[PDB]
Design an enzyme around this catalytic site. Structure first.
Site, mmCIF file in Angstrom:
data_model
loop_
_atom_site.group_PDB
_atom_site.id
_atom_site.type_symbol
_atom_site.label_atom_id
_atom_site.label_comp_id
_atom_site.label_asym_id
_atom_site.label_seq_id
_atom_site.Cartn_x
_atom_site.Cartn_y
_atom_site.Cartn_z
ATOM 1 N N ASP A 9 -24.760 33.208 100.438
ATOM 2 C CA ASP A 9 -24.991 33.439 99.013
ATOM 3 C C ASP A 9 -24.639 34.884 98.721
ATOM 4 O O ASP A 9 -24.501 35.696 99.637
ATOM 5 C CB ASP A 9 -26.454 33.219 98.611
ATOM 6 C CG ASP A 9 -26.670 33.394 97.108
ATOM 7 O OD1 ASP A 9 -27.718 33.931 96.687
ATOM 8 O OD2 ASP A 9 -25.776 32.992 96.335
ATOM 9 N N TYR A 41 -21.759 37.849 91.749
ATOM 10 C CA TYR A 41 -20.496 37.116 91.682
ATOM 11 C C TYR A 41 -20.224 36.575 90.265
ATOM 12 O O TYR A 41 -19.070 36.383 89.873
ATOM 13 C CB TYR A 41 -20.522 35.948 92.682
ATOM 14 C CG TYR A 41 -20.208 36.309 94.128
ATOM 15 C CD1 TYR A 41 -20.242 37.635 94.580
ATOM 16 C CD2 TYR A 41 -19.889 35.309 95.051
ATOM 17 C CE1 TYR A 41 -19.963 37.951 95.926
ATOM 18 C CE2 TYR A 41 -19.611 35.609 96.381
ATOM 19 C CZ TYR A 41 -19.648 36.927 96.817
ATOM 20 O OH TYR A 41 -19.371 37.205 98.139
ATOM 21 N N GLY A 42 -21.291 36.338 89.507
ATOM 22 C CA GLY A 42 -21.153 35.811 88.157
ATOM 23 C C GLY A 42 -20.111 36.495 87.289
ATOM 24 O O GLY A 42 -19.411 35.839 86.516
ATOM 25 N N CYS A 73 -24.429 28.903 96.796
ATOM 26 C CA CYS A 73 -24.147 29.785 95.680
ATOM 27 C C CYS A 73 -23.266 29.033 94.677
ATOM 28 O O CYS A 73 -22.126 28.698 94.988
ATOM 29 C CB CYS A 73 -23.405 31.007 96.236
ATOM 30 S SG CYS A 73 -22.731 32.166 95.057
ATOM 31 N N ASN A 74 -23.787 28.772 93.477
ATOM 32 C CA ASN A 74 -23.023 28.053 92.452
ATOM 33 C C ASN A 74 -21.767 28.786 91.988
ATOM 34 O O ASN A 74 -20.712 28.171 91.808
ATOM 35 C CB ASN A 74 -23.900 27.751 91.230
ATOM 36 C CG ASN A 74 -25.023 26.789 91.540
ATOM 37 O OD1 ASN A 74 -26.044 27.168 92.125
ATOM 38 N ND2 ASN A 74 -24.843 25.528 91.155
ATOM 39 N N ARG A 85 -12.381 24.870 103.297
ATOM 40 C CA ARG A 85 -12.162 23.645 104.044
ATOM 41 C C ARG A 85 -10.786 23.613 104.687
ATOM 42 O O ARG A 85 -10.575 22.913 105.670
ATOM 43 C CB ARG A 85 -12.378 22.434 103.135
ATOM 44 C CG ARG A 85 -13.854 22.188 102.859
ATOM 45 C CD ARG A 85 -14.110 21.190 101.728
ATOM 46 N NE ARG A 85 -15.549 20.986 101.571
ATOM 47 C CZ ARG A 85 -16.136 20.486 100.486
ATOM 48 N NH1 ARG A 85 -15.416 20.126 99.436
ATOM 49 N NH2 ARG A 85 -17.452 20.357 100.453
ATOM 50 N N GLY A 94 -21.047 22.473 99.692
ATOM 51 C CA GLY A 94 -21.013 23.227 98.458
ATOM 52 C C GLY A 94 -22.194 22.853 97.585
ATOM 53 O O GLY A 94 -22.977 21.966 97.934
ATOM 54 N N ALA A 98 -27.503 20.131 89.668
ATOM 55 C CA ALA A 98 -28.001 18.759 89.808
ATOM 56 C C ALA A 98 -28.100 17.984 88.495
ATOM 57 O O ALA A 98 -29.123 17.359 88.202
ATOM 58 C CB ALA A 98 -29.363 18.776 90.504
ATOM 59 N N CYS A 185 -28.576 27.540 89.484
ATOM 60 C CA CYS A 185 -28.338 28.823 90.128
ATOM 61 C C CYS A 185 -29.313 28.796 91.298
ATOM 62 O O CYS A 185 -30.509 28.579 91.101
ATOM 63 C CB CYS A 185 -28.658 29.973 89.175
ATOM 64 S SG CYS A 185 -28.185 31.584 89.815
ATOM 65 N N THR A 186 -28.818 28.991 92.518
ATOM 66 C CA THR A 186 -29.700 28.940 93.683
ATOM 67 C C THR A 186 -30.784 30.019 93.673
ATOM 68 O O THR A 186 -31.733 29.968 94.456
ATOM 69 C CB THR A 186 -28.898 29.011 95.011
ATOM 70 O OG1 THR A 186 -28.267 30.291 95.134
ATOM 71 C CG2 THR A 186 -27.826 27.926 95.035
HETATM 72 C C1 UMA Z 1 -24.100 12.156 99.342
HETATM 73 C C2 UMA Z 1 -23.150 12.602 98.251
HETATM 74 O O1 UMA Z 1 -21.964 12.297 98.327
HETATM 75 N N1 UMA Z 1 -23.633 13.339 97.237
HETATM 76 C C3 UMA Z 1 -22.823 13.658 96.046
HETATM 77 C C4 UMA Z 1 -23.341 12.968 94.812
HETATM 78 O O2 UMA Z 1 -24.670 13.382 94.494
HETATM 79 P P1 UMA Z 1 -25.885 12.437 93.921
HETATM 80 O O3 UMA Z 1 -26.583 13.055 92.813
HETATM 81 O O4 UMA Z 1 -25.278 11.119 93.709
HETATM 82 O O5 UMA Z 1 -26.791 12.339 95.230
HETATM 83 P P2 UMA Z 1 -27.489 13.441 96.191
HETATM 84 O O6 UMA Z 1 -26.682 13.618 97.406
HETATM 85 O O7 UMA Z 1 -28.887 13.233 96.388
HETATM 86 O O8 UMA Z 1 -27.271 14.791 95.379
HETATM 87 C C5 UMA Z 1 -28.117 15.227 94.375
HETATM 88 C C6 UMA Z 1 -27.532 16.397 93.690
HETATM 89 O O9 UMA Z 1 -27.619 17.490 94.596
HETATM 90 C C7 UMA Z 1 -26.467 18.299 94.561
HETATM 91 N N2 UMA Z 1 -25.678 18.286 95.843
HETATM 92 C C8 UMA Z 1 -25.829 17.293 96.823
HETATM 93 C C9 UMA Z 1 -25.115 17.293 97.967
HETATM 94 C C10 UMA Z 1 -24.110 18.408 98.220
HETATM 95 O O10 UMA Z 1 -23.422 18.501 99.226
HETATM 96 N N3 UMA Z 1 -23.999 19.378 97.212
HETATM 97 C C11 UMA Z 1 -24.716 19.403 96.025
HETATM 98 O O11 UMA Z 1 -24.549 20.297 95.210
HETATM 99 C C12 UMA Z 1 -25.667 17.681 93.427
HETATM 100 O O12 UMA Z 1 -25.812 18.392 92.135
HETATM 101 C C13 UMA Z 1 -26.072 16.249 93.307
HETATM 102 O O13 UMA Z 1 -25.802 15.931 91.916
HETATM 103 O O14 UMA Z 1 -22.549 13.284 93.636
HETATM 104 C C14 UMA Z 1 -22.541 14.725 93.304
HETATM 105 C C15 UMA Z 1 -21.717 14.870 92.037
HETATM 106 O O15 UMA Z 1 -20.368 14.502 92.285
HETATM 107 C C16 UMA Z 1 -21.972 15.494 94.500
HETATM 108 O O16 UMA Z 1 -21.976 16.882 94.236
HETATM 109 C C17 UMA Z 1 -22.790 15.171 95.773
HETATM 110 O O17 UMA Z 1 -22.204 15.890 96.912
HETATM 111 C C18 UMA Z 1 -20.955 15.628 97.601
HETATM 112 C C19 UMA Z 1 -21.232 15.622 99.118
HETATM 113 C C20 UMA Z 1 -19.819 16.477 97.133
HETATM 114 O O18 UMA Z 1 -18.671 16.070 97.173
HETATM 115 N N4 UMA Z 1 -20.169 17.693 96.683
HETATM 116 C C21 UMA Z 1 -19.240 18.769 96.308
HETATM 117 C C22 UMA Z 1 -20.037 20.040 95.992
HETATM 118 C C23 UMA Z 1 -18.147 19.094 97.370
HETATM 119 O O19 UMA Z 1 -18.444 18.908 98.572
HETATM 120 O O20 UMA Z 1 -17.024 19.510 96.986
HETATM 121 N N1 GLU Z 2 -27.120 32.444 93.901
HETATM 122 C C1 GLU Z 2 -26.399 32.577 92.632
HETATM 123 C C2 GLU Z 2 -25.489 33.814 92.679
HETATM 124 C C3 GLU Z 2 -25.621 34.632 91.375
HETATM 125 C C4 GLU Z 2 -24.520 35.680 91.275
HETATM 126 O O1 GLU Z 2 -24.076 36.229 92.288
HETATM 127 O O2 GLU Z 2 -24.073 35.992 90.174
HETATM 128 C C5 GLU Z 2 -25.577 31.322 92.409
HETATM 129 O O3 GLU Z 2 -26.047 30.178 92.758
HETATM 130 O O4 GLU Z 2 -24.427 31.396 91.863
#
Ligand code: UMA
Ligand code: GLU
Length: 266
Positions: A9, A41-42, A73-74, A85, A94, A98, A185-186
């Site tokens: 982060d 980073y924002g 980090c969002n 990757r 990533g 949510a 935002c984490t």
């Molecule tokens: C198991 C799986 O494939 N999860 C994908 C799915 O989330 P969904 O809401 O259906 O189920 P969940 O896994 O319980 O996730 C809940 C929420 O937690 C967050 N979440 C979850 C897993 C993750 O790796 N990253 C993330 O940011 C998401 O905002 C998601 O909306 O739909 C979301 C919306 O498309 C995805 O961000 C999420 O991550 C996958 C693994 C993904 O591809 N994430 C992105 C960030 C990436 O890897 O490029």
């Molecule tokens: N942890 C914050 C970082 C905030 C920032 O650096 O601006 C995020 O999820 O993006």
């Protein structure tokens, strides 16, 4: 020796994601790295962010082979995932707000999104809002100040509730405020207690923590290479400054005994 997992982060926000991950996988060899040199980073240009995060993960990989890395980090996830990757051969996790689960939880159809100033201006965001939240109205609120409040808190300063109320004034003046608020935002989950004292009764907070933990456990099972270490958990800063040093006690409470400077080439 256990699998080495990196949680990254720009600052302390990553700790909220790490906290959920360790609760699910408590024995891993964790490495926490924060970019105190380029935080926040924002504001930063996306071209800089991608190069910077790739350079930091590269430096960490030199210290310890990684089984998996989490960009907790969002403001960095979206733009940095493809590049990360491509360069590395370990799974990269990533984070995106949510919005999807929040849309299925709201009862009044009003979902709020609290993110930093830069995250609410991203196309990646606006899109997600339309993809999984077409049946509800989204109230966005970007606040760089809230990020600072979170930083201050983990640095030992008390969070001013009046400052929070001011930031959330727009919502507190609504006839029907969101009944579900997404912490996009984490750094924000770290302010959960404070947020719940200021937000209208009954507001449900939703973040990505537990879901990230589950995704991490799944990847460590179906994709992570055999990269492990018996060394204790460690925290890396990019510059040994007074600010970074002031996080030592909190980092230790989180399970990181040591804080060291990481040499980065980018
Ligand atoms: C198991 C799986 O494939 N999860 C994908 C799915 O989330 P969904 O809401 O259906 O189920 P969940 O896994 O319980 O996730 C809940 C929420 O937690 C967050 N979440 C979850 C897993 C993750 O790796 N990253 C993330 O940011 C998401 O905002 C998601 O909306 O739909 C979301 C919306 O498309 C995805 O961000 C999420 O991550 C996958 C693994 C993904 O591809 N994430 C992105 C960030 C990436 O890897 O490029
Ligand atoms: N942890 C914050 C970082 C905030 C920032 O650096 O601006 C995020 O999820 O993006």
């Amino acid at each position: 020796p256990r699998p080495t997992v990196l949680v990254f982060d720009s600052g302390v926000g990553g700790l909220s994601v790490y906290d959920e991950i360790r609760h699910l996988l408590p024995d891993l060899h964790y490495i926490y790295a924060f970019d105190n040199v380029a935080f926040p980073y924002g504001e930063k240009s996306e071209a800089f962010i991608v190069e910077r995060v790739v350079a930091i993960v590269t430096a960490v990989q030199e210290r310890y082979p990684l089984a998996l890395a989490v960009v907790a980090c969002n403001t960095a996830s979206t733009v940095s995932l493809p590049a990360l990757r491509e360069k590395f051969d370990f799974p990269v996790v990533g984070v995106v707000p949510a919005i999807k689960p929040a849309a299925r939880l709201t009862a009044n159809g009003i979902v709020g999104l609290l993110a930093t100033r830069g995250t609410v201006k991203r196309s990646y965001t606006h899109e997600l809002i339309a993809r999984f939240a077409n049946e509800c109205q989204i109230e966005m609120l970007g606040s760089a100040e809230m990020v600072e409040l979170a930083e201050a808190k983990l640095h030992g300063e008390d969070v001013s509730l009046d400052a929070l109320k001011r930031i959330l004034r727009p919502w507190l003046r609504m006839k029907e405020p969101p009944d579900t608020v997404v912490l996009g935002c984490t750094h924000f989950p770290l302010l959960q207690e404070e947020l719940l004292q200021v937000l209208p009764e009954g507001t449900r907070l939703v973040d990505s923590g537990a879901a990230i933990a589950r995704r991490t456990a799944w990847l460590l099972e179906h994709e992570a290479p055999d990269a492990k270490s018996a060394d204790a958990n460690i925290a890396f800063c990019m510059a040994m400054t007074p600010g970074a040093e002031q996080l030592l006690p909190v980092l230790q409470r989180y399970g990181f005994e040591t804080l060291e400077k990481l040499a980065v080439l980018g």
